[PDB]
Amino acid sequence: SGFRKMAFPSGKVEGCMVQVTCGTTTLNGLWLDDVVYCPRHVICTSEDMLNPNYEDLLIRKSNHNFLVQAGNVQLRVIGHSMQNCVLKLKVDTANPKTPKYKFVRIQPGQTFSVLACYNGSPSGVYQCAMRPNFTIKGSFLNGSCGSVGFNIDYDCVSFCYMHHMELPTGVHVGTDLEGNFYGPFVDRQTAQAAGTDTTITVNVLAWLYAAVINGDRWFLNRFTTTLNDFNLVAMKYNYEPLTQDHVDILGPLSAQTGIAVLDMCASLKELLQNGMNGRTILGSALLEDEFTPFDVVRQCS
Amino acid sequence: SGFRKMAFPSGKVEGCMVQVTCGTTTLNGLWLDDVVYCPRHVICTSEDMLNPNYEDLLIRKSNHNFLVQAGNVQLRVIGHSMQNCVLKLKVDTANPKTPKYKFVRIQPGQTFSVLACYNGSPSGVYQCAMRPNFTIKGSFLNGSCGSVGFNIDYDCVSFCYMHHMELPTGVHVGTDLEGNFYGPFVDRQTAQAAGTDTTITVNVLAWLYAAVINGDRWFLNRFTTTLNDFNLVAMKYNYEPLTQDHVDILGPLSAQTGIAVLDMCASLKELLQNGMNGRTILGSALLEDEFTPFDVVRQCS
Ligand SMILES: *C(=N)[C@H](C[C@@H]1CCNC1=O)NC(=O)[C@@H]1[C@@H]2[C@H](CN1C(=O)[C@@H](NC(=O)C(F)(F)F)C(C)(C)C)C2(C)C
Ligand SMILES: *C(=N)[C@H](C[C@@H]1CCNC1=O)NC(=O)[C@@H]1[C@@H]2[C@H](CN1C(=O)[C@@H](NC(=O)C(F)(F)F)C(C)(C)C)C2(C)C
């Protein structure tokens, strides 16, 4: 019993973290096989960052300009190329600690574990959700770029995120491991804004099943609702429309607890219009949308 | 920028997790050098657990009765002994992945990272605080016993906790890595109760410094207070007395932000008597006491 914001065991990813230094700039890199992946603003000076021309900056660099360090060992760079906003540095040594891996592009609403690094040294691990406006509510200081977001399926590490920037609102933005940003952001030091964020409805309902599995069941009411009547009520609260695909994903939890998805929508509909009346759910006073149905099935089954 | 409940990178501990099976019972073990540490109720049947005599159960066992598995490899047990509520099994192979380590007894109020395991396989990592009533608010299913709590000082793993039980209230109890329970609990399946829990005052103030470092500063008032006048007001809210030792520990944060500890106590005193008036601090609607001053200095400096 018990429900906690859990992160994946980061050990497989720790063995891949390297420190990439170019000129005076130092950030983190992901060393998988004979290639190191890192944000392309490692080739920037502080003056360059206000408006950089990464293609112009990179042509002026050679393999020896990049200082890659794996612990105390310096890895000799034998090739370099840029894929969108990521820089790939081929090295003479393949990582013996390289786990089984794939590079995926997560969808908004899905979660991942962030392994926060500084100087190629992991410092901490925490769980994040890719918001519908394509930002994450992380905790990143200077030098944290190149810290990656990942999920673990038994023995396979699916890397889905690489840290690049922090917005004026405090939220964090980054790319997939192919260099493509999540959201309409560019890697230049200029004022940038994220779109309107919405509440991930399927995650709130999944978190309500986790609450029932844990004995918190005061919000359970006797009514049912239609998917259409739930979406009209939830619309004014900035809740994304719950689709049939979301109802299908909620199946395993609904089968386990014996509470139909549409009966749980009627419970949430009351919580939306009437509030919590000073009560808490799973210790929290606010409804939570950062736990996906799979994250709930992971701990509560 | 950003403030998150962060856990230590669990990689060093993952390389120490083994699966200990005796008879039909299977739980986790911590393999450091040539010794495996595990809860002593691995030698119990389900009937034995209501009221066990572990000394009587263990004398009936020999080295071959214990099945220790490190991945696919079975470790041959060449010795066994019981230290309080932990069982130590000497093995013929010393763990090549054993990190630099020490065994510590944490104080109430301090935090640690829990690496949750099942069948000797790590499944997740999360941060816990040892409550003043000696319980933790974890998330443990069946077979999670032997999952350890730890802190990492650069390269040294200080193991401070091992999971044993879940109380009727939902909270979790365990021993240090010497077999001594935290709190007045016994490892038998009987109704057990934890004492009255209190609010860790020094952690609330540390979390208020993290909030100011992050731009959340609406609660900052113009007043100061004495340590004595703060403790009298906080007493009725079930806040533990803030001692001079706590004020000294809060020094680094107070120096960094430029807010005196006694000025932050006056801000908290207002929050205690007047409430939050519908406002949140660091996104939370309730005051938080699970982040120690060192946890704040870790991310916010
Ligand atoms: C990479 N190590 C840092 C991580 C930053 C440090 C503070 N928290 C973070 O997320 N990334 C940067 O410093 C990038 C980098 C130049 C500027 N920058 C930013 O994240 C800036 N933000 C933006 O420009 C904005 F608003 F568009 F997102 C900064 C003002 C420093 C927070 C480049 C090349 C984009
Ligand atoms: C070890 N793998 C489990 C972990 C349990 C499983 C559910 N969540 C947990 O923390 N530990 C046990 O099953 C121990 C074990 C017998 C009973 N037990 C308990 O934790 C029970 N609780 C208590 O007896 C109580 F209330 F005193 F804490 C249980 C009712 C199963 C939750 C022994 C030997 C104590």
Author numbering:
A (entry chain A), B (entry chain A): 1 to 301
What does the paper say about this structure?
Severe acute respiratory syndrome coronavirus 2 (SARS-CoV-2) encodes a main protease (Mpro, nsp5, 3CLpro) that is essential for virus replication. Mpro cleaves coronavirus polyprotein 1a and 1ab at 11 junctions with a conserved Gln residue at the P1 site, a feature with no known human analogs. The essential function in coronavirus replication, together with the absence of closely related homologs in humans, identifies Mpro as an attractive antiviral drug target. The SARS-CoV-2 Mpro inhibitor, nirmatrelvir, was found and developed as the oral COVID-19 treatment Paxlovid (nirmatrelvir/ritonavir).
